[PDB]
Design a protein around this nucleic acid. Structure first.
Lengths: 153, 148
DNA sequence: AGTTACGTACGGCACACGTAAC
DNA sequence: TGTTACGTGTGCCGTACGTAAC
C-alpha cells in the first residue's frame, strides 16, 4: 500500500529471523513484498538495485548459500565480477533468552583474487542458528536459505 | 495494518522537510503526534508512534527572558546536550540541524545521568530568515526520544 | 595452487562529563 | 546561585585487512 512519508521497512534483527527467514526455511514458497530472491553468486551489487523490490536506501533479498567445495564445509562467496569477504565477528540474535539467529557482515572486493579491490558495498547476511541450528532442523533448507541486506557506504 | 518490520524510520531530511517544515509554515498543519514536553517525565511520555522509539513535537521556550537560552529543565531532571550538532542537507542546501541531548535525573548542578537519549531536529537552515514571521513566538521542533 | 574465514586492529560516530557562559 | 551549553575524551561500533586455514 502507499506508505505515509518516512514509514519504511527497517526491521529489528529478531523480526527478520522470526517473521521472514524462519517461515521461508520451512516453506520454500514463502513470499514477502518487501524482500525478493536473487543468487548473489550470479547477480552483481552494481546491478542489484535494478532487480530489487520496495527499496531505495537499503535492499533486502533472500539467497541460497552454496557450499564452495564438496567437502569444504564452507560457502561459495564468489561472483562473476568479484568476491564477498567476511569481516569481523558475527552478532548473536536473541528472542527472549533463546538464541534464534546470527548476523555476518560482508564487504565486496572486485578483485575476484587475493588482490581484491575494496568496494563500499556492504551486505548483512542473517542466518538461522541457535534454537534453529541445522542439528535440530527437520531436513529443511536452513543452512542454505539466508536473508541478506545490501547497502553502499 | 503494516507487515512486520514496516515502521516509522524517517531519514534526517525526511523529518525536517515532510513533518517539521509544514508545521512551521502552516501552523498546526498528520498522525505524527504532539506533546507539551513541559514538565513531563520521559518514562511517562509514552503514556505511541512506536514502542521502539517515540517521535513527538515540542515548543522550545526561553528559560531567561534576556538569556535566549532554551529551557531544558523538568521536575524530574534536565536534558544535557552532548557533543556537537549534525547538519541535514536536502542536496547542497542546509535545511536542518540535529542536537543530541541525554536526560540527567536529579535537576541539580551534578544530576545522575540516565539512559534516556533524545535527538532534537530543528529547522535551523531557514530559521534566520524567518520566511514566515509567526507572531506566536513558538519554536517548533521534532524529537526522537528513546531509552537505549 | 585458489578461495574462504578468523580475529585483532583502527577510524568514525554517539555520547560522557568537565569546564565555561548566560 | 542556578541553569544551560560547549568541546574535548572516549569508549564502542563498523569495518580493514593480514594470516591462517580449508
Amino acid at each position: 500500500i502507499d506508505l505515509p512519508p518516512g514509514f519504511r521497512f527497517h526491521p529489528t534483527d529478531e523480526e527478520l529471523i522470526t517473521h521472514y527467514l524462519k517461515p521461508k526455511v520451512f516453506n520454500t514458497f514463502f513470499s514477502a513484498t518487501a524482500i525478493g530472491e536473487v543468487d548473489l553468486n550470479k547477480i552483481e551489487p552494481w546491478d542489484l538495485p535494478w532487480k530489487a523490490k520496495m527499496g531505495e536506501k537499503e535492499w533486502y533479498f533472500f539467497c541460497v548459500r552454496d557450499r564452495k567445495y564438496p567437502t569444504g564445509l564452507r560457502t561459495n562467496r564468489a561472483t562473476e565480477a568479484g568476491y564477498w569477504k567476511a569481516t569481523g565477528k558475527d552478532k548473536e540474535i536473541f528472542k527472549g533468552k533463546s538464541l534464534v539467529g546470527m548476523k555476518k557482515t560482508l564487504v565486496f572486493y572486485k578483485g575476484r583474487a587475493p588482490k581484491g579491490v575494496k568496494t563500499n558495498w556492504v551486505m548483512h547476511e542473517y542466518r538461522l542458528e541457535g534454537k534453529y541450528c541445522i542439528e535440530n532442523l527437520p531436513q529443511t533448507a536452513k543452512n542454505e536459505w539466508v536473508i541478506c541486506r545490501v547497502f553502499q557506504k
